[model samples]
Target: GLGTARLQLVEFSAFVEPRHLFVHISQLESVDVRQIYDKFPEKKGGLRELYDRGPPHAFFLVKFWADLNWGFYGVSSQYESLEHMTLTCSSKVCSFGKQVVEKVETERAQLEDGRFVYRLLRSPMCEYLVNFLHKLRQLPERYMMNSVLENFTILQVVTNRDTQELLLCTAYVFEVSTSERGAQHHIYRLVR
Candidate 1:
């Protein structure tokens, strides 16, 4: 007898802090990996400025190293001023290399399930919602036996300056009370 439930994004964020965004490595296809290599060729710059510009107008030299992939390299960035930005792996062995591999693997597995992998960064709120829907689908009787979270769509995103909290607008579909019934449509708030 489960009816539709529109879980607010604000409420969802309460379940987890929306940090650690995820991205697929494939998205880096358009980036020129060689540029990074030329910039940090000998790792002489290490943490030095391969590029420089200050806060609002500042950019940093970010580097990555990998043994299996590209080896090592650096990229210029203005991440300090940007709220959301995408960075490519400089090499397979750098500090963030392991993390990238793990995150990519996790997301890749999800993609195998016929889910559309979002190219944008994913927050803890996003992960929570996905996990929540998955758990709900596994409920023996409270939810439809064939229940499945068909999709996850992000409608909007907001951040509170005072509280450093996040607000999200998301939509998802899942079986209602039984497989015979149509899936429920939900769009609501989630905050963290």
Candidate 2:
């Protein structure tokens, strides 16, 4: 008999790291300086210190969910500028989900043709799983090929061409399994 196969959300959270401090600075830019001066004129030095030191790295509690057919969805104020994200997944039949928090880093690169490239660092978890699958490939009797989940990362690049402003873009996708568990104990595939 076929058991139930459904996607389940395990846990989700967001944190600020020193590597991406620019994200915080971007937010502060939108705040009105006059209001801060009016509210705390006596403690200007402390406020300056706060700005100079920057906020400590900490995880903020976030409410999120992973749909059965769709991907993860979360409520975040800085979703637009979030350079790194995490995901956890599991099956409804199981009591606990396999939690995996994957982090991705982007670095700027240049091509010989004067084009820009944003090289992304794959998450450690992704590599681990890929290697695991590779091992399974050796035992043909125990493993079977399944669907691939390609997560695409896109960037918008603008350029001036022929005295006119033009919008350019580039994107790349990586196969990273974001879910676990299956109806049969023998077959396992990640659902994204």
Candidate maximizing TM-score: 2
Please write out the lDDT profile of model 2 over residues 4-81, one tens digit for every residue: 111111111212222111001111012322223222212322222323332221101111111121111121111111
- Angstrom error of the Cα, residue 90, model 1: value is 29
Work out how many backbone clashes candidate 1 has: 15
Minimum summed lDDT over a 10-residue window in model 1 is located at 63-72
**For model 1, how does the per-residue alpha-carbon lDDT over 114-187 read when each residue is reduced to its tens digit?**
32221222222334444544455455554233323222212122222333332211111123333233222232
Identify the runs in model 2 with alpha carbons over 4 angstroms from their true place. Answer: 1-101, 109-111, 120-127, 141-143, 147-192
TM-score of each: 0.18, 0.22
Candidate 1 TM-score versus the reference: 0.18
